[PDB]
Every structure is written in C-alpha cells, then in structure tokens.
Amino acid sequence: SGVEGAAFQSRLPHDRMTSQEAACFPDIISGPQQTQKVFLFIRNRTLQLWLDNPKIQLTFEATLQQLEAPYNSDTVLVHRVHSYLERHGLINFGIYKRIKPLPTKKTGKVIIIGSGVSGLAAARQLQSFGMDVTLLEARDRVGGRVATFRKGNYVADLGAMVVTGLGGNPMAVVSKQVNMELAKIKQKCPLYEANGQAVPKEKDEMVEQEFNRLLEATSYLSHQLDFNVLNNKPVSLGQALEVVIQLQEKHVKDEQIEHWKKIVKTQEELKELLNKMVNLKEKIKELHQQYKEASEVKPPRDITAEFLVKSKHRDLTALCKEYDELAETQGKLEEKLQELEANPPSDVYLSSRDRQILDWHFANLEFANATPLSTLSLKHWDQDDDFEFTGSHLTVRNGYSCVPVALAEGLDIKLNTAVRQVRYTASGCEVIAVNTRSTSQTFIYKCDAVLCTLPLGVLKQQPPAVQFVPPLPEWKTSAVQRMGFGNLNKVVLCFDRVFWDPSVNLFGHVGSTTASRGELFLFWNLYKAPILLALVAGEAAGIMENISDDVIVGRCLAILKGIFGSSAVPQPKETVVSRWRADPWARGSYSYVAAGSSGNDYDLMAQPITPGPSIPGAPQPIPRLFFAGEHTIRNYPATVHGALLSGLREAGRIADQFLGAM
C-alpha cells in the first residue's frame, strides 16, 4: 500500500518505531505522537524510493527533493533518517551505481575472515562507508555455502538454491540488481513408495493430516503440559513425537479394552437370563405335568379337584407369561451383541505403510532443520516462524553463485588463504594465515578490527582450526557448544533426456525403515537442462558421506527405475555428491536450535569481543572482534538472506565504532 508496503519489504512495522530506531532517535520516541508519525513517513518514503529503483544510489539530496510538505520542512530530521537507513544497510546495499565515486582517502582497516554472503555483504558496506577492507578466504572461490556446480551446459546448486519467498526478503532487492533467473517452484509433490508405486490420494492426505496433528500435539506438550525437561535433560522434538505416538497407541488399546468389556458385560447379563430361563422351563415342564394329571381326573369332580385344575391353569399361564417377558429380553441383548460385534474400534493407530509414509514427513522436517529430530529443541526449534516471508519459493536457475560473484566485484579478496590464528588487543589486531596450496608460506595482517564469519562448524572444531589469542570468553564458547550445526547433502544427476514429468518440480521416495528415512527421500526438477537433484537428510546424511559416489548414484538409479521403468532411466552423463560435514571450511550445512539451546544463543553469537587493557589502569578499550554469519542472526538463521542481513548489521556496528555514529 505504497509507503506501508516499503516498511513490510524492509521487515519493519509501518505504524511504530523499532528498538534500533529508539536508540538512534531517543528524542522522537520519547516526544509527542505527531513527530513520531513524521519520522515514520520519512522512513517509509525513503525506503520506498530506494526499493523503487535499487540499481542506483539514493542520496540525501535526491530524498529531500522527492519529499513533500510538511515532511520536507525539517531538513536535519530527513538527514538523520537517511543516514540511519544507510548506516544500517536498509537503503544502498548490494550492487548499485554510485552517483559520486567513493572518497580516495580511507579511514580505518578491517580484516574479514571468510568470503561467503555474510562476509561479502559486510565488505561492500564497509568499503562504501570509506574503510580499508580485505577479505581472507580459504577456498579457491567466493560464496562459501553458496556453491554452484558447472560442467558444460549443466548448472546445479550443491549448497543454497531456494529463495524462500520475496515478500520481506532482502534477496528481492539483490534479484533486481543481479540477473538471477528466479523460477517459481510448484508445490505439487507426489510420493512413491519403496515398490515404486505412488501413494493413493486418500492415504497420502490422511498421513499428512496426522503428521501436522502430531506436530501440533508436541507444541501442546511443550506449552500447556510443560514437558520440556526429562531426567535433568532438555526434551527433543523427536522425544516428544515418540511420547505422542505412544499415547495414541495407548488410546487405541484403551478403547479396544473398553469395547470388549462392553461385550463381556452383555454376555454375563445374557448368562444370568439364560440360567433364569432354563430353571423356569423346568418349572413350567413340572407344572404342566401336574396340570394334566389333575385334568385327567374326569368329571364329575368335587370343588377341591376342580380348584386343582383351575389353580394349576392360572399358575402355568403366569409362568408362561414370565417366560415370554424373558424371551424377548433375550432378543434385545442378542441384537445389542450383534451391533457391538459389527462395530469394533481401530485395530492399530498406524499400519506398517502408514508409519513409513509418516517417516517421509519426518525426513522432510529433518531436511529443513538439517538435523535428526532427536537433536532439535522442543520449545524453540521453530522460534523463527513469525519471520517467514510471503509468496512462492523460487529456484535460482542461473545458479546461486551469481550472487556472491557479483558481490565480490571491486573487493580485495585473498583466495587460498586459510586463517590459523586471530590476535586482538587494545592497540589493534593481528590475523595469521597460511597459503592452502603451500602451508609453510605464512601471512600476517594488521588491522583495527576483525570480522569473523567462520561457520559454526569451524568454531566448534576440537582441536581448533582457528586459535583466538586471548581465548574467547566462556559465554561465547558455551554458546558455540550449545548451538546445533546440522548436515544435509545433495546428489546431482545429469542426463541426456527428460524421462520424468516436466510440470512436476518435486517428488518423494518413501524409505523402508525409520533408520533410512532421509536417504534419497526427495527429488528436485528445477533446471532448464535435464537435471534431477536428490537429497540426503537426517541420520542418513552423516552416514552416506562414508559411502562412495558410484554406490550413491546406483541407489539413486534403482529408486528412479522403480518409479519410471528400467528401460526409461539411462546412465547419467555427469554426477556430483556433496559431502558438507567432511568439508573442512564448513563442517556441516547450517545451524539449528539444539535441545538445551534457544534463540538467545544466536544473540550471544552476534555479540562483539572487547579485549582487556594493555597497561593496567588504562581506560576501557573498544570492541575489536566482531561476528557475522547465518549462526549469528536470531530471526533469520540458516539462510542466505540471514547471512546477508548479519553482514549488513556488523558493517553498521563496525562503522559506528570506527567512523563514529550517524
């Protein structure tokens, strides 16, 4: 809705001021309501102006000229807002044409460790703020966990590949700046069982509904029943799902017991009636004989002999009336027994097939979180849900590497340079690095500040790949330990011809056991060339890294032949298998919220380190060691956009420290 849509696209509320804005504009937020609305409009309009054309720099001069009365009345207010938005990277980020070239004299010196999206985004900002920036990258390429396979005409992503909707996504801006061939992914995903036959529509919808019900139940367990600690240990999502499933199996058995208990009570009610009837039939038999004996005493009789005939007649008919009132009650209980035998409860909660299809949905969840469900925090695994972008998910058909390559332009990047040691004191910083091709060749880099974008997997390493001098404080290292770093792998299969449904982007393979549920469970058809991409998720990812490419591709072909036919599936021209946990420069795929951890650990990851004074009694020194990366952004973890935003945050923080605020 114009200016309101600009705030939404920048992840800001249109009608109120944020915590960051309150810090930079305390006079406004504590002041009258009218001035706040003036601030909010200037903010929203400036954002709209940038968002309308993100290919060119938006200056203060261009901003003020396009503002109307009475908003362009206060010129220093407009300047304060513009500077704030520029400094925090909400406007003028990414690849844009600079209207007046950057000042020749550079102020301050920053070393950035790592040339992924977080590193590159921070580097661009710091350079455009007028700082001396050098990036040190261990790999022979930029991009990091954005890694695109390219051989001949085949293009496929081994790392990041999906833009998770454009509504509120900073990657929407980047896509208007860099030629990303964004193609919408169609949601339709048919599942094929181990035999190779598709799951019927009725069963498929039943299992999926039960899956979401099971997930909703674990949330109920967490929030309402407070089932978060068990045996002095934090409860995992996997644990909670087991508990819910077990209680559903219990209810199936409890309702079976209650049903067959209604049968025995009816049978025993019938048993008491049948005994009563057998005893009365014998009394009726005896009294009939007594009647006919008295009746065979032929007339004329005295009145006592007549009474004997008449009284035995009354007594017999009364017992026959009593028998008839039990005979239809027998019928009432036999039909009650008929309907109970015809209407039993459920035999099982889930069959063997139902459990297997459910294990696919669990594997799909294990893909998303890049980790087995027994490692995820029950309370906090989905803490970033409210920050989900709107719109369809999109493939980067051009190959995602086009983004970091474009961000790399005009930057001083030292490739094949592995950081070994980070030194930080009150005077400044030393970064000690080696050449990866020749490890004896040593490099020393001196700087005012260090920005660490090393993956969480690298920071977790014992023994360490990178040493910090002095050692990182306990609050930092404990957060590094608590936090989860997951794993996920991809198998790229390049063919000469399309043998699959071209209008179907996604199809699933249902595994035989729970143990192998994530093993080649999902297939992607996304690219212009005939390429199929298979995922290895959950417990399978770590195990499948110890298996050779030929065997993995063999298992891929066996699954596809089951679905499409042996004659229909040719041998692939090119194959690639990712091994992200084994990769020394990643040591996994992306962060997750582990059991025992929370969203607060992401904030602790983001917090800069301040060294002690050199001389004792010297004033409190400034922060020297800064952190960015997907593992440092609470609201957008484990993504490209989150990495991007973490870089923009840190550049703004470093510039505030070393160039002064505003």
Binding site: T164, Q187, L215, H361, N364, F367, A368, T639
Partner: peptide, 14 residues
C-alpha cells in the same frame, strides 16, 4: 529451519 520447506510445508505448531 522450518521456513525452508518448499515441498509439503508443515503447519502444526505455528
């Protein structure tokens, strides 16, 4: 994280 589910997006517990 959960927002990355392109295929069969989970709904339970949001």
């Amino acid at each position: 994280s959960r927002t990355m589910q392109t295929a069969r997006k989970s709904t339970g517990g949001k």
